[PDB]
């Protein structure tokens, strides 16, 4: 029918017992589906940027290249992050969700979604987490929108899955509005470790401090999926507000089921937990893009539908 939600504080969290109580209490406020451990804990690292001294020599390609260039280093830092004074887990490998193979018939999606390791999603999966391939790619926009359907579809698109962001926060339209494409690194955890998550958040905050950021980060959100039966320039400054958290609510209603069905993981009976977002802010400059200017500059093999 629809995705129902239930939110619990982050301060003291523990997954509900599976069968400790045969019958839940009558005045219990918890939903009846909030029984077992979640399928996964989705941690999103929202990466926003701003080219502060914007000038007229920037192009639409740079609006994508400048933030996505940092994506590979950010993914490597997240993957290699280790808690230096841990008492429990140390590395991402001990807690994140492991995926073996995509479903047969997804030969087209092979080498675009991770396999045989941690389920970490980012725009770098287009170039297979290879900054050399990213730098040698002649059309970043063409590669990103290569697998875009020409009509609306129920399933989430590959670009939507990899960016983890609603379409209005990306796309070549932001160049006209002088904004910058903002993406999200999606971490999928099999286990929840408060200390590791706090260390990761603090490490990212230390690496890329976000000014004027006051995100609450106070509650988890659990989403339950029911069964389906049919029978002059003034470049805009990076602003963090109440709409930046809970940005997953603006994604497609088939986003997470589409992602998890690719790996033969079902969400029909179970639920997932969405951790509070980790803000990351990048300060970019136009000189980087100007020096990284390439041939085949203003021509791309992708025309968005404009009628």
């Amino acid at each position, epitope marked *: 029918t629809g995705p129902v939600e239930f939110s619990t504080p982050v301060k003291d969290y523990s997954p509900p017992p599976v069968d400790s109580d045969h019958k839940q209490g009558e005045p219990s406020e918890q939903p009846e589906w909030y029984v077992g451990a979640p399928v996964a804990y989705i941690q999103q690292i929202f990466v926003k940027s701003s080219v502060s001294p914007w000038h007229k020599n920037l192009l639409a390609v740079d609006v994508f290249r400048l933030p996505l260039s940092r994506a590979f280093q950010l993914v490597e830092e997240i993957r290699n992050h280790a808690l230096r004074d841990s*008492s429990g887990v140390k590395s991402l490998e001990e807690v994140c969700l492991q995926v073996t193979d995509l479903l047969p018939g997804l030969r087209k999606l092979r080498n675009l979604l991770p396999e045989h390791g941690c389920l970490l999603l980012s725009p770098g999966n287009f170039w297979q987490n290879d900054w050399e391939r990213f730098h040698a790619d002649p059309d970043i926009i063409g590669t990103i929108h290569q697998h875009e359907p020409k009509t609306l579809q129920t399933s989430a698109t590959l670009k939507d899955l990899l960016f983890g962001v609603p379409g209005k926060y990306s796309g070549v339209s932001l160049y006209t509005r002088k904004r910058t494409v903002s993406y999200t690194i999606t971490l999928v955890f099999q286990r929840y470790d408060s200390r590791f998550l706090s260390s990761l958040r603090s490490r990212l905050k230390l690496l890329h401090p976000s000014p004027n950021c006051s995100l609450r980060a106070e509650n988890l959100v659990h989403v339950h999926f029911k069964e389906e039966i049919g029978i002059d320039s003034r470049a805009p400054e990076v602003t963090w507000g109440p709409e930046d958290e809970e940005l997953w609510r603006r994604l497609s209603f088939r986003h997470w089921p589409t992602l998890f069905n690719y790996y033969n993981i079902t969400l029909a009976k179970r639920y997932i937990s969405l951790l509070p977002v980790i803000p990351v802010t990048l300060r970019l400059n136009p000189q980087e893009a100007l020096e990284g200017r390439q041939p085949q500059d203003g021509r791309s093999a992708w025309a968005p539908p404009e009628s």
Partner: antibody
Amino acid sequence: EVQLQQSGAELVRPGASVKLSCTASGFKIKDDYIHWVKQRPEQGLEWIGRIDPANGHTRYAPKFQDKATITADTSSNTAYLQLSSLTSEDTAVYYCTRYNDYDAFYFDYWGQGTTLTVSS
Amino acid sequence: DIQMTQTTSSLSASLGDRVTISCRASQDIRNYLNWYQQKPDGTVKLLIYYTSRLHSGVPSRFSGSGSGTDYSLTISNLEQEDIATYFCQQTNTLPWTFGGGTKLEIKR
């Protein structure tokens, strides 16, 4: 608002043992690690070890492996440091501290320190 | 282990004058340095963590800088209450080590 209240001064014979204490106010020790730092007048500050009161996982500097033993209990919100086989080298001022950020690992709030004296 | 070295043990200064305190790491510690202040009565207080992040409540006079193996602590203008001992602590390799500490004085 956050305080770490330490015990009084100590004076023990060499070869004995002492059980230092550290009372916490304004927060609960389950939330953060509690550390202990050793200061001698001419050797500067030395890090002894830490504890995680949630699960009791303690780790020490290799110098203090056979010397220190850090224990804490949540019920009284107090952390303790134990030193065994005391000698004249062990007289110092021991500080109690914690941290709340888990990547910078900066010691956030300190106690006033307890002076320990070892002499016949 | 990593040896933290404060070359100067004492450092004379005068009120209003800016004061700089620097310490050297034995190896790269990746901007994981902490600065502490110890009053003569024995109270210890955190001033700066990471490398330049001011702790909450610490006055704006204190500032830090440095990278790799060299770091420094600066005080914009010295007040009477700023006369104390300052230590640098590295938090890169797990056995945290402190420097020798620098003690401030008054010009005579």
